[PDB]
Design a protein around this ligand. Structure first.
Ligand SMILES: COCC(=O)NCc1nc2ccccc2[nH]1
Length: 164
């Protein structure tokens, strides 16, 4: 069946106040079927609040829209985000002592462009502590990662969360 609607939404900030439901829709329909598209407005003045949201039919369409950033909508670069604590770094726990950089890179590179991999070691002994941090060049990688129920790396079922 269909992915949960919450995972098919993009919250678009930074809109031009002249963007309408119709112009936001015409823009974002380039990357998929939109089941919903709303510009948020003041209830009395009808003046735009400068943000809105679009709902795609599938998660792959959300991915396509995010991969097509930067989006210039009605002359202004906007800020799309999935369903916000916006960070580029993750904690990866449960990797034990046998997990190496290449295991983490080969897996996580498919979520985004990696800038730093830090495998944590004991300050006194140098032994691996069984966790790591991965820093990406952009927050959408992290957002995709943390909504997955499971992460399997080097045969380990890992705990992954946003870091700082
Ligand atoms: C990114 O996190 C999801 C979320 O709901 N953030 C606040 C939020 N609430 C909204 C209601 C209508 C349109 C846009 C909205 N944005």
């Amino acid at each position: 069946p269909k992915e949960p609607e919450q995972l098919r939404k993009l919250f678009i900030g930074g809109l031009s106040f002249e963007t309408t439901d119709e112009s936001l829709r015409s823009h974002f329909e380039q990357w998929g079927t939109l089941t919903d598209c709303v510009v948020m407005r003041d209830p009395n003045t009808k003046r735009s609040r400068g943000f809105g949201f679009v709902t795609y039919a599938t998660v792959e369409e959300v991915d396509a829209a995010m991969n097509a950033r930067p989006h210039k909508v009605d002359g202004r670069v906007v800020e799309p985000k999935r369903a916000h604590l916006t960070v580029k770094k993750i904690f990866v726990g449960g990797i034990k002592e046998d997990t190496e950089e290449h295991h983490l890179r080969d897996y996580f590179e498919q979520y985004g462009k990696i800038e730093v991999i830090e495998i944590m070691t004991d300050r006194g002994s140098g032994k691996k502590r069984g966790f790591a941090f991965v820093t990406f060049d952009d927050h959408d990688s992290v957002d995709k990662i943390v909504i997955q129920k499971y992460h399997t790396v080097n045969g380990h079922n890992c705990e992954v969360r946003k870091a700082l």
